Design an enzyme around this catalytic site. Structure first.
Site, mmCIF file in Angstrom:
data_model
loop_
_atom_site.group_PDB
_atom_site.id
_atom_site.type_symbol
_atom_site.label_atom_id
_atom_site.label_comp_id
_atom_site.label_asym_id
_atom_site.label_seq_id
_atom_site.Cartn_x
_atom_site.Cartn_y
_atom_site.Cartn_z
ATOM 1 C CB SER A 266 -2.582 -0.142 -2.517
ATOM 2 O OG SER A 266 -3.419 0.246 -1.440
ATOM 3 C CD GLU B 263 -4.231 6.747 3.309
ATOM 4 O OE1 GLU B 263 -4.283 5.704 2.616
ATOM 5 O OE2 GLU B 263 -3.214 7.054 3.976
ATOM 6 C CG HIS C 16 0.552 6.595 0.808
ATOM 7 N ND1 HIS C 16 -0.224 7.704 1.082
ATOM 8 C CD2 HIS C 16 -0.006 5.567 1.484
ATOM 9 C CE1 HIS C 16 -1.213 7.356 1.885
ATOM 10 N NE2 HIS C 16 -1.106 6.064 2.141
ATOM 11 C CG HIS D 50 -1.586 1.311 1.511
ATOM 12 N ND1 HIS D 50 -2.586 1.856 0.729
ATOM 13 C CD2 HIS D 50 -1.378 2.191 2.518
ATOM 14 C CE1 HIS D 50 -2.959 3.018 1.238
ATOM 15 N NE2 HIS D 50 -2.238 3.242 2.324
HETATM 16 C C1 LIG Z 1 -5.341 8.893 10.387
HETATM 17 N N1 LIG Z 1 -4.224 8.061 10.904
HETATM 18 C C2 LIG Z 1 -4.010 8.007 12.224
HETATM 19 O O1 LIG Z 1 -4.748 8.635 12.971
HETATM 20 N N2 LIG Z 1 -2.978 7.226 12.746
HETATM 21 C C3 LIG Z 1 -2.167 6.531 11.860
HETATM 22 O O2 LIG Z 1 -1.243 5.848 12.336
HETATM 23 C C4 LIG Z 1 -2.427 6.612 10.538
HETATM 24 C C5 LIG Z 1 -3.441 7.372 10.067
HETATM 25 N N3 LIG Z 1 -3.479 7.289 8.732
HETATM 26 C C6 LIG Z 1 -2.486 6.471 8.385
HETATM 27 S S1 LIG Z 1 -2.092 6.029 6.695
HETATM 28 C C7 LIG Z 1 -3.400 4.921 6.300
HETATM 29 N N4 LIG Z 1 -4.379 4.519 7.108
HETATM 30 C C8 LIG Z 1 -5.145 3.688 6.375
HETATM 31 C C9 LIG Z 1 -6.256 3.018 6.689
HETATM 32 C C10 LIG Z 1 -6.887 2.219 5.736
HETATM 33 C C11 LIG Z 1 -6.364 2.098 4.453
HETATM 34 N N5 LIG Z 1 -7.036 1.315 3.580
HETATM 35 C C12 LIG Z 1 -6.457 0.644 2.556
HETATM 36 O O3 LIG Z 1 -5.250 0.604 2.290
HETATM 37 C C13 LIG Z 1 -7.450 -0.202 1.735
HETATM 38 C C14 LIG Z 1 -6.683 -1.453 1.306
HETATM 39 C C15 LIG Z 1 -7.415 -2.764 1.605
HETATM 40 N N6 LIG Z 1 -8.870 -2.624 1.741
HETATM 41 C C16 LIG Z 1 -7.074 -3.767 0.487
HETATM 42 O O4 LIG Z 1 -7.657 -4.869 0.520
HETATM 43 O O5 LIG Z 1 -6.193 -3.425 -0.338
HETATM 44 C C17 LIG Z 1 -5.204 2.824 4.168
HETATM 45 C C18 LIG Z 1 -4.632 3.586 5.133
HETATM 46 N N7 LIG Z 1 -3.540 4.350 5.100
HETATM 47 N N8 LIG Z 1 -1.837 6.044 9.472
HETATM 48 C C19 LIG Z 1 -0.642 5.121 9.506
HETATM 49 C C20 LIG Z 1 -0.977 3.831 9.960
HETATM 50 C C21 LIG Z 1 0.047 2.928 10.233
HETATM 51 C C22 LIG Z 1 -0.250 1.637 10.681
HETATM 52 C C23 LIG Z 1 -1.577 1.246 10.862
HETATM 53 C C24 LIG Z 1 -2.604 2.148 10.590
HETATM 54 C C25 LIG Z 1 -2.304 3.434 10.138
HETATM 55 FE FE LIG Z 2 -2.323 4.988 3.451
#
Ligand SMILES: Cn1c(=O)[nH]c(=O)c2c1nc(Sc1nc3ccc(NC(=O)CC[C@@H](N)C(=O)O)cc3[nH]1)n2Cc1ccccc1
Ligand SMILES: [Fe+3]
Length: 291
Positions: A233, A214, A174, A169
């Site tokens: 992704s 996103e 990104h 992803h």
């Molecule tokens: C707003 N926010 C926060 O408060 N804290 C974070 O740590 C954070 C964040 N935002 C991101 S970045 C981020 N959050 C996400 C949530 C969903 C998805 N969904 C998919 O990828 C769909 C794909 C799938 N359906 C498929 O089958 O392929 C993409 C995201 N990108 N992070 C970093 C973080 C690091 C580790 C874990 C979680 C978040």
């Molecule tokens: Fe992301």
């Protein structure tokens, strides 16, 4: 009073490790939940990120054949869809990454290489992250053009689904847009706006981030195109988002920030930005009203 916020890029050392949920702590529904070998691999990746300090080269990882196959499977299929689905800026930057960072089906790019590439193009850099951070801490990284980035790979049992960000992803969704100056500026300003902001304001900024960075769509030469990393992704939602059966509304921060961010299903609605420049302008006006 104003909560603590990082004042220089190395201050991310203090909030990057304030992990709410560690990378190794898998939810009951995780494909690898019952896999103790994958569990150990995830602990290894989490440990690399926890030990990382600003200034370090990002540790290079030797990915297993199974991990590389998972990447290749995802890579192969998404690349069929990008020409007819992705925004022009994405399409412009992805071949640069193939050339300079080793994006190919049989190779997973190293975060350090991708970080050095971005530093040259837009000043963005990567920081490996253990697991989920507070929105305040995650967005504060963007203020210094730092993207907190997962380094592990999804479980190989299902290459086409992940309940969470993984490094497929990050690299495919990104990175190509962080390499675009207008997008990098747009992203940084989300981070800058968040610094020292109220909890309320941080949450609204995080929701605006979600429905642009996103899951955003944009209009280019009269067509709807994708720029959201979570769409770029995901084979199934990428197709769905431009299918004609998705609800779509104009990006408008005061309206968009009221929308729920869905994590385990397709979004209920997608928001269309006129351009990265316009989205940026709209956020500037919005930030005045909440900060
Ligand atoms: C707003 N926010 C926060 O408060 N804290 C974070 O740590 C954070 C964040 N935002 C991101 S970045 C981020 N959050 C996400 C949530 C969903 C998805 N969904 C998919 O990828 C769909 C794909 C799938 N359906 C498929 O089958 O392929 C993409 C995201 N990108 N992070 C970093 C973080 C690091 C580790 C874990 C979680 C978040
Ligand atoms: Fe992301």
């Amino acid at each position: 009073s104003v909560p603590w916020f990082p004042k220089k890029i190395s201050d991310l050392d203090h909030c990057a490790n304030r992990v709410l949920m560690y990378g190794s702590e898998l939810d009951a529904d995780h494909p690898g939940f019952k896999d103790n070998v994958y569990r150990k691999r995830r602990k290894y990746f989490a440990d690399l990120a926890m030990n990382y300090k600003h200034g370090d080269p990002i540790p290079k990882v030797e990915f297993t054949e199974e991990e590389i196959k998972t990447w290749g499977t995802v890579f192969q299929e998404l690349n069929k869809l990008y020409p007819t689905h992705a925004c022009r800026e994405y399409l412009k930057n992805l071949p640069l990454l193939s050339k300079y960072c080793g994006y190919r089906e049989d190779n997973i790019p190293q975060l350090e290489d991708v970080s050095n590439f971005l530093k040259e193009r837009t000043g963005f850099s990567i920081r490996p992250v253990a697991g989920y951070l507070s929105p305040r801490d995650f967005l504060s990284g963007l203020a210094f053009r730092v993207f907190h980035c997962t380094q592990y790979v999804r479980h190989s049992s299902d290459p086409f689904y992940t309940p969470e960000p993984d490094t497929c992803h990050e690299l495919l969704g990104h990175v190509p847009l962080l390499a675009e100056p207008s997008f990098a500026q747009f992203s940084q300003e989300i981070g800058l706006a968040s610094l020292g902001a109220s909890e309320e304001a941080v949450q609204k900024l995080a929701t605006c981030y979600f429905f642009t960075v996103e899951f955003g769509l944009c209009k280019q030469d009269g067509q709807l195109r994708v720029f959201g990393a979570g769409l770029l992704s995901s084979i199934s939602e990428l197709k769905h988002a431009l299918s004609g059966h998705a609800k779509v509304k104009p990006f408008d921060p005061k309206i968009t920030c009221k929308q729920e961010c869905l994590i385990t299903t397709f979004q209920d609605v997608y928001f269309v930005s006129e351009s990265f420049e316009d989205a940026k302008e709209k956020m500037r006006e919005f930030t005045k009203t909440i900060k």
